[PDB]
């Protein structure tokens, strides 16, 4: 017997979307205003600074690199990654003032739900928190705007079973990457980290 004839359920399209050509970091590099240059030493593509980091103005220059993470094409992508990582790790205490200004571009980058943008933002999440030994406790009020995307990809993982995993080098598995940043935030955030994280993502379990 039959009692209804209804619709079809949405076929889990959460990974396919991929836009292009968004950022504002382009226009500053489209005219040679960004003081970065590419060095083509054959070992690895390395970047060079037109302005030494000692005299760099962090409040205006750091947010621009965070904007470039949303880029899809090669040079802006590579310059954004290398510039962001270098500045965050070597800047030190000067980063803490730039957190309210760099969260918004990071929020925009995370909201794209792109296949490759989210891994870079997740790694940037890791490196931003470990700047000096502080500023992981300053992201607590920003959890309500940064973490909501991590719910989307939290439970996605590769189910194989007996098969040995082959992709561990170019580790792309979203579940393991999300878990790493959540442990890093939980260890670095402090006593109030777990309360806010558990409020945001109820699936997570403590590291205390």
């Amino acid at each position: 017997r039959e009692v209804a004839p209804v619709k079809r359920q949405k076929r889990s399209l959460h990974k396919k979307v991929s836009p292009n050509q968004h950022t504002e970091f382009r226009r500053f590099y489209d005219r040679g205003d960004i003081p970065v240059r590419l060095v083509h030493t054959t070992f690895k593509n390395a970047i060079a600074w037109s302005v030494d980091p000692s005299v760099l103005d962090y409040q205006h220059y750091l947010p621009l690199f965070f904007d470039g993470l949303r880029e899809k094409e090669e040079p802006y992508r590579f310059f954004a990654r290398k510039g962001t990582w270098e500045l965050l790790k070597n800047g030190g205490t000067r980063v803490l003032q730039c957190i309210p200004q760099v969260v918004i571009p990071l929020k925009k980058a995370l909201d794209t739900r792109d296949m490759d943008i989210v891994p870079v933002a997740l790694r940037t999440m890791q490196k931003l928190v470990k700047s000096s030994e502080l500023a992981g406790e300053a992201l607590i009020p920003f959890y309500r705007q940064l973490l909501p995307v991590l719910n989307e990809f939290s439970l996605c993982n590769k189910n194989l079973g007996d098969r040995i995993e082959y992709g561990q080098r170019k580790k792309e598995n979203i579940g393991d990457l999300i878990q790493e940043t959540l442990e890093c935030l939980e260890l670095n955030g402090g006593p109030e980290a777990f309360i806010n994280i558990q409020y945001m993502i109820p699936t997570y379990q403590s590291a205390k």
């Binding site: 054959t42 070992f43 690895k44 098969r163 040995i164 082959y166 992709g167 561990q168 080098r169």
Partner: protein, 427 residues
């Protein structure tokens, strides 16, 4: 059962490996898509030795391809059996070497080493029992030689018990292809002597000689030469995959043929070989195979054993044949030519039998012997290298990569000791 992991460095090695997997796939009856469609149940007795299974009726070979430029990788994917290779196993760089041995060894070797070890660890741990790996590379080049030497040292460090079987192609003394060829072989040999358990030598000159001595083809291509090398490849490992009346493996071959640790460089040869039209005239029997194997024209290494002496010899057979006939043939060849065999080691010849012959061949055989004729090969490269080395100019390329100039003398001194070691064992 007892697995072997296959490694393909080198533009030469990749083509050799690609043809080798074509031969094995035809031998076992594996579709280019990896699905079994054969006719013999014996083909699935020990297919796990070379293949891993992907649920869904798909078998993936234990193949790892290494390079420094993606051009070779693109060519391999364009091949007929390119879908069989696992895409992730392809590991390659972006900055080539350009036949510069030092550049491949130091500059890109350090980067490529860390990554490639993870796949070699994965497949080594994806078997119930590992016997040894397998390396195919060229010596005159700069990518396969330098990187293979680095990976051979790393393989020895990580896996001491496992047998590191290496197959190499010696630069052609008369006409090979590069200005700088003596330098690459000079630095590669020192690493090969200490680490590799077994080294097999093949020369392109002998292959072209074999083509016009026996095959009578007009315009031979690299496909035929790679096919003969793959034929020797299959014959060496055949006894592991199929039963027989007298079984031998890489360990048994090493024990019998190697009397001393450094005397392990071997020559290879195959029989039967017959031109496309003369095969009707020939009556293929056990004595005919014995004549072809020991014949100098069929030897695929450019070193005449008659100029030297034999230390150990080994013969393997594929098909169904009388063991008495094989033993009699081995004894007769030993008594007839006593002027070539070392006096203090009797019964220098080994024998083995494999039940299943290859496709199309009713009877087949493979010969691996060790002789003092190898001293000519190192003498040739040393002679060419000597006047290369006295004119420092060409090494200045390798000096840029951080290589010390004293590295060349250490390698040359090692070859001189090896040549002397082969000399006094003749007496």
């Amino acid at each position: 059962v007892r697995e072997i992991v296959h490694i393909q460095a080198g533009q030469c090695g990749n083509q050799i490996g690609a043809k080798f997997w074509e031969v094995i796939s035809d031998e076992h009856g594996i579709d280019p898509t990896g699905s079994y469609h054969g006719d013999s149940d014996l083909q699935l007795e020990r297919i796990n030795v070379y293949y891993n299974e992907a649920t869904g009726g798909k078998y993936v070979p234990r193949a790892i391809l290494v390079d420094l430029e993606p051009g070779t990788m693109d060519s391999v994917r364009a091949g007929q059996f390119g879908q069989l290779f696992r895409p992730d196993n392809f590991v390659f760089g972006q900055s080539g070497a350009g036949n510069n041995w030092a550049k491949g060894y130091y500059t890109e070797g350090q980067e490529l080493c860390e990554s490639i070890l993870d796949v070699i660890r994965k497949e080594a741990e994806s078997c119930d029992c590992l016997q040894g790996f397998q390396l195919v590379h060229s010596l005159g080049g700069g990518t396969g030689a330098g990187l293979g030497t680095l990976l051979l040292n790393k393989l020895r460090e990580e896996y001491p018990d496992r047998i590191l079987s290496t197959y190499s192609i010696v630069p052609s003394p008369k006409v090979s292809d590069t200005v700088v060829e003596p330098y690459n072989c000079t630095l590669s040999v020192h690493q090969l002597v200490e680490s590799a358990d077994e080294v097999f030598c093949i020369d392109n000159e002998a292959l072209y000689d074999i083509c016009f001595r026996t095959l009578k083809l007009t315009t031979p291509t690299y496909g035929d030469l790679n096919h003969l090398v793959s034929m020797v490849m299959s014959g060496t490992t055949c006894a592991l995959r199929f039963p027989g009346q007298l079984n031998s493996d890489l360990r048994k071959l090493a024990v019998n043929l190697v009397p001393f640790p450094r005397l392990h460089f071997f020559i290879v040869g195959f029989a039967p070989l017959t031109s496309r039209g003369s095969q009707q005239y020939r009556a293929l029997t056990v004595p005919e195979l014995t004549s072809q194997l020991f014949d100098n024209k069929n030897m695929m290494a450019a070193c005449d054993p008659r100029r030297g002496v034999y230390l150990t010899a080994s013969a393997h057979f594929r098909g169904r044949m009388s063991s008495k006939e094989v033993d009699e043939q081995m004894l007769n060849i030993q008594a007839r030519n006593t002027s070539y065999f070392v006096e203090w080691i009797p019964s220098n010849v080994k024998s083995a039998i494999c039940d299943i012959p290859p496709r199309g061949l009713k009877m087949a055989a493979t010969f691996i012997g060790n002789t003092t004729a190898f001293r000519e090969l190192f003498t040739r490269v040393d002679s060419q290298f000597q006047k290369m080395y006295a004119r420092r100019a060409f090494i200045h390329w390798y000096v840029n990569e951080g290589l010390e100039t004293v590295e060349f003398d250490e390698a040359r001194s090692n070859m001189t000791d090896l040549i002397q070691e082969y000399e006094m064992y003749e007496t």
